[PDB]
Amino acid sequence: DAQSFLNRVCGVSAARLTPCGTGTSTDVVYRAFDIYNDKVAGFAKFLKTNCCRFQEKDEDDNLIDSYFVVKRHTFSNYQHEETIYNLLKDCPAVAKHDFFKFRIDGDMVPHISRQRLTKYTMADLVYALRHFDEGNCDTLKEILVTYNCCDDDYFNKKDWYDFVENPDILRVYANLGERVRQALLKTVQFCDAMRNAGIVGVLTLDNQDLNGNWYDFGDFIQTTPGSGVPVVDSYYSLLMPILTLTRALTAESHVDTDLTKPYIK
Numbered sequence: 001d002a003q004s005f006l007n008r009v010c011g012v013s014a015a016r017l018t019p020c021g022t023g024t025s026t027d028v029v030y031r032a033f034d035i036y037n038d039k040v041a042g043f044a045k046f047l048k049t050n051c052c053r054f055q056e057k058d059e060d061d062n063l064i065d066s067y068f069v070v071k072r073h074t075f076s077n078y079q080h081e082e083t084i085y086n087l088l089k090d091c092p093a094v095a096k097h098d099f100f101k102f103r104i105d106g107d108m109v110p111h112i113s114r115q116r117l118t119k120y121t122m123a124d125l126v127y128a129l130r131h132f133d134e135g136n137c138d139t140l141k142e143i144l145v146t147y148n149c150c151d152d153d154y155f156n157k158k159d160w161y162d163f164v165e166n167p168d169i170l171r172v173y174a175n176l177g178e179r180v181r182q183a184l185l186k187t188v189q190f191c192d193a194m195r196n197a198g199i200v201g202v203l204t205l206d207n208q209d210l211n212g213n214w215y216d217f218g219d220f221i222q223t224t225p226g227s228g229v230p231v232v233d234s235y236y237s238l239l240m241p242i243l244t245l246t247r248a249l250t251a252e253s254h255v256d257t258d259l260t261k262p263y264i265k
């Protein structure tokens with residue numbers, strides 16, 4: 001049933017979930033992976049299929065930007081991800097997981113659930129700002145709207161995207177800046193939580209939702225604690241043109257790095 005499954009996914013975290021999928025079946029969505037393995041490589045828009053997605057709604061039944069991705073995979077990967085998460089649990093930049101085994105049809109399929117991710121990961125912001133195409137920019141309108149950079153009528157302007165006819169677009173993009181900068185800070189906590197726990201892995205962009213949290217421990221192998229390494233070659237590098245389109249460091253010219261406080265003199 002898709003109702004006992006929902007009442008399991010809600011868990012102990014008192015959240016009210018509307019299934020974006022349909023009937024305990026995975027929701028196939030078109031996303032922006034950054035991937036390298038023995039067959040494929042690149043920063044490309046693939047199509048992910050292994051994740052049931054439920055959206056949480058607040059009081060008065062309004063949908064907020066907070067989802068519950070419930071990725072289902074093999075039992076061995078579930079066990080490995082459970083031990084890696086129980087090492088990295090104490091970190092604050094790690095989205096809260098929930099590991100359960102549920103009767104899907106006649107068998108216990110192991111689901112690992114991730115709580116309160118946003119809709120689009122950082123790779124979707126970076127891909128939609130790096131691979132711009134003004135006919136088809138719908139994961140940039142939705143990111144700009146849903147994080148209050150503009151107000152969904154800004155796109156009724158004739159050329160809202162144009163840096164030379166509409167220079168005000170820079171003020172729009174800079175309103176993403178503090179959402180990006182906090183993301184950077186959360187990475188440096190997560191990298192630290194890897195280094196002090198002895199976990200070796202590759203930080204990709206698409207494993208970080210736009211709040212900042214990190215949520216994929218599939219190919220992290222653990223070594224002796226105090227000596228793990230994070231590999232952030234292709235995290236910081238793909239992200240790099242976004243750190244000045246969106247002016248991510250203009251909260252650093254303010255005293256004690258708070259956007260409310262006055263400038264440093």
Ligand SMILES: Nc1ncnc2c1ncn2[C@@H]1O[C@H](COP(=O)(O)OP(=O)(O)O)[C@@H](O)[C@H]1O
Pocket residue numbers: 048049050071072073077206207215216217218219
């Ligand atoms: N064929 C598959 N079906 C489902 N899950 C898989 C498959 N191959 C790998 N995985 C697991 O999913 C991860 C990649 O899934 P992905 O689509 O990136 O979702 P997420 O970003 O949540 O990991 C890998 O780390 C691995 O643990």
Ligand SMILES: [Mg+2]
Pocket residue numbers: 206207216
């Ligand atoms: Mg992943």
